[PDB]
Amino acid sequence: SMQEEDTFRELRIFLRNVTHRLAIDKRFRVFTKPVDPDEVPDYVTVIKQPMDLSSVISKIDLHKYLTVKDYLRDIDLICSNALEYNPDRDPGDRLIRHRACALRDTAYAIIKEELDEDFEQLCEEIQESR
Numbered sequence: 001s002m003q004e005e006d007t008f009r010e011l012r013i014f015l016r017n018v019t020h021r022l023a024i025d026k027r028f029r030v031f032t033k034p035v036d037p038d039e040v041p042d043y044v045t046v047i048k049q050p051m052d053l054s055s056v057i058s059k060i061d062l063h064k065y066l067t068v069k070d071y072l073r074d075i076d077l078i079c080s081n082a083l084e085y086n087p088d089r090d091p092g093d094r095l096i097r098h099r100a101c102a103l104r105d106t107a108y109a110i111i112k113e114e115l116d117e118d119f120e121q122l123c124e125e126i127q128e129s130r
């Protein structure tokens with residue numbers, strides 16, 4: 001219906017805004033674009049579902065997220081990919097893991113503050129009805 005289309009449009013607007021605020025944070029530059037195959041060739045073989053904030057924006061615009069829960073699965077994916085691929089004690093690995101956890105925590109915190117629970121509940125109920 002028109003009302004449901006409006007609901008999903010508001011969701012997309014909300015998610016673009018959250019995603020932009022993560023994307024402009026200097027700490028998260030490493031998560032803004034797909035990993036460069038030239039810089040690292042073995043990433044595609046180790047990480048089976050690469051995810052990044054530009055890909056999240058593309059998915060928002062393709063109507064791939066019908067709930068904030070589904071959006072957060074991809075934010076969690078960016079984080080878990082980073083923890084999996086960079087597990088070592090070296091400072092490069094520890095820096096990226098700290099940033100990955102910070103990205104995750106920041107997204108959840110923005111959502112906890114600015115997502116209305118009844119809005120999310122509506123989204124989930126429309127999704128489940130389809």
Ligand SMILES: Cc1cc2ccnc(NC3CCNCC3)c2[nH]c1=O
Nearest residue numbers: 030035081082085086090092093096
């Ligand atoms: C997303 C991403 C980017 C990246 C860039 C450069 N290096 C990485 N890993 C190194 C592995 C060896 N230790 C230093 C860090 C990257 N890892 C990523 O997950």
